[PDB]
Amino acid sequence: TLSILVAHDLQRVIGFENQLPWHLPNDLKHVKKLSTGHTLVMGRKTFESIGKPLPNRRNVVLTSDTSFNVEGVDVIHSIEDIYQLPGHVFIFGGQTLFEEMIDKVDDMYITVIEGKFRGDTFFPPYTFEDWEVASSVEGKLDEKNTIPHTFLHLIRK
């Protein structure tokens, strides 16, 4: 299975200055739950911003850099390489990867951040005409989680 995994705001903002625009522990938990034991595929800029591979799953980085060889990370140099990865593969970001893969994935796991943030990177536009809502779950608000959010699982019609 090939899935997108993304958190975007009301205007599809996903990032600002190579970082996430918001702080939301519950969404980190969501990512951990979904992708532990599976595979994340991410672009070079996203990886470098994270700074190290995420524990307990396969980390795959897409880059043109022939010198990229990082401990605990597998490198790919083409989009076509993604389709050779076994198991459940999550396209993890950032903007460039989402733009390349939105028309190809089976599935999308989207956290809608119910606010409007300043961004410089965006998830591509999509229409519910193309996607069935398999599930929609309101995020619980906390002292630690203060931005309303909704976990959507969308399946390509």
Ligand X SMILES: CCc1nc(N)nc(N)c1C#CCc1cc(OC)ccc1OC
Binding site for ligand X (CB under 6 A): 5-7, 19-20, 27-28, 30-31, 46, 49-50, 54, 92-93, 111
Smallest distance, ligand NDP to C-beta of residue 13, A: 8
**Least distance in angstroms from the C-beta of 21 to ligand NDP:** 8
Of residues 8, 21, 23, 5, the one with CA closest to residue 119: 21
28 binds, among ligand X, ligand NDP, none (CB under 5 to 8 A by kind): ligand X
- Tally of residues, the chain: 157
66 or 146: CB nearest ligand X: 146
Smallest distance, Å, CB 127 to ligand X?
20
For residue 121, the partner it binds in ligand X, ligand NDP, none, with Cβ less than 5 to 8 A by kind, is ligand NDP
Q: What dihedral do alpha carbons 72, 67, 61, 49 form, nearest 10°? A: 90
Q: 39 by DSSP, 3-state: which?
A: strand
Q: Look at the alpha carbons of 151, 88, 105, 70 in this order and tell me if their dihedral is positive or negative.
A: positive
Identify what 139 binds: ligand X, ligand NDP, none; CB under 5 to 8 Å per kind: none
Residue 145 main-chain phi, psi, to 5 deg: -130, 100
